[PDB]
Structures are given as C-alpha cells and as structure tokens.
C-alpha cells in the first residue's frame, strides 16, 4: 500500500547493516590500530632497556 510500512522496511535494513558492521568491518580494522600502537611502544621500551 501507500506510506507508513516503509518505517519498518528502513528500520530492518538499518539494524542489519549495524550488526554486520559490528562483526565484519569494525573489529578487523581497530585491531591494526592496537597493533601499531604496540609496535611503536615496543621500540621506545627496547631503546631505554638497551641503553640501561
């Protein structure tokens, strides 16, 4: 029919894209940021330990 069931048609699409992003897009990219912060931190810690 004509106007309001699109309120649930768009809501269902929204929730599906949010759950997909939360499991298959966000975790693999945030992990690379966590790793680089440790790669730089390990270099600064190794330099101080080597000097001492």
């Amino acid at each position: 029919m004509n106007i309001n069931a699109t309120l649930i048609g768009q809501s269902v699409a929204f929730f599906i894209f949010v759950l997909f992003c939360m499991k298959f897009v966000w975790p693999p990219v945030i992990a690379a940021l966590q790793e680089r912060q440790k790669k730089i931190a390990d270099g600064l810690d190794a330099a101080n330990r080597a000097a001492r």
Binding site: A46, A47, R49, A50, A51
Partner: protein
C-alpha cells in the same frame, strides 16, 4: 640498535677481561724483578766475609 648494543657490550666485556689480564701480568713481571734484585742485594751483602 638493540642488536648492535649487544654486539658492543660483547666487545667492551672481552676488552675489559684482556686489559685486566695484562694489568695483573705486568704486576707479576714487576714482582719477579723486585725479588731478583733483592737476591742480588743479599748476594752482594756477603762482602762481610772480607769487609769485616
């Protein structure tokens, strides 16, 4: 830089062993000279068989 620091520490450590060995070797060479000169003094002191 950490790998190079371990190689440098390996040189500084062995150079200190070699210098410490040479410092004690020269001391033992000096000690031997002192006792030999003392033997010649004690041997020359034997002049008392005629000087007295």
């Amino acid at each position: 830089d950490l790998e190079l620091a371990h190689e440098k520490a390996g040189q500084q450590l062995r150079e200190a062993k070699a210098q410490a060995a040479e410092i004690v070797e020269q001391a033992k060479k000096r000690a031997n000279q002192i006792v030999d000169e003392a033997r010649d003094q004690a041997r020359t002191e034997g002049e008392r068989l005629k000087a007295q």
